[PDB]
């Protein structure tokens, strides 16, 4: 599992940006966006893994992700919140 961030390919970013409402993408966005997404994912999974190893278990549940999200200001409804 090395260099998987290239799995967030260009069409996926195009679709996200279309749903966002933008009309004419530049050509450099497709790396700034992967950087932003990697930063967000690190910030969330760090707290998820903290919550999951404080409870003395080795399985990242969905309540752990829900808590790690709610703690940063971004709640999330639908996954047992």
């Amino acid at each position: 599992l090395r260099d998987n961030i290239q799995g967030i390919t260009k069409p996926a970013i195009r679709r996200l940006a279309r749903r966002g409402g933008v009309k004419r993408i530049s050509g450099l966005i497709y790396e700034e966006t992967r950087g932003v997404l990697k930063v967000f994912l690190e910030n969330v999974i760090r707290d998820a893994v903290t919550y999951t190893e404080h409870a003395k278990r080795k399985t990242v549940t969905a309540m752990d992700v829900v808590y790690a999200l709610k703690r940063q200001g971004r709640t999330l409804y639908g996954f047992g919140g």
Partner: protein, 106 residues
């Protein structure tokens, strides 16, 4: 007087298929990132914290939801910045300004 009723090659110019994808995505509600690449990305990022976790199948999915509802929202803001600078393209100096004003960089 009668009874009223309710019923009885090609090349699109650049900028029109975009305005159609916008309308067809702003009305759909599915996930816009492949699921196996995101699975692998989450698993690969969680190596730097603990070696061998098991990532119950609803955790991953959960993350994906947030990971969309963040990026999408971000793009909205960046869009305005672009429109503010009297242009139509969104550039990396727009994302950075949105993230700065919004508080994520300071």
């Amino acid at each position: 007087a009668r009874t009223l009723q309710t019923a009885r090659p090609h090349r699109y110019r650049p900028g029109t298929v975009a305005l159609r994808e916008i309308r067809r995505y702003q009305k759909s509600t599915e996930l816009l990132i492949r699921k196996l690449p995101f699975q692998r990305l989450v698993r690969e990022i969680a190596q730097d914290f603990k070696t061998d976790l098991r990532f119950q199948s609803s955790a991953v999915l959960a993350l994906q939801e947030a990971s969309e509802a963040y990026l999408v929202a971000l793009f909205e803001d960046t869009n305005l910045c672009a429109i503010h600078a009297k242009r139509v393209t969104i550039l990396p100096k727009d994302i950075q300004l949105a993230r700065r004003i919004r508080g994520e960089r300071a």
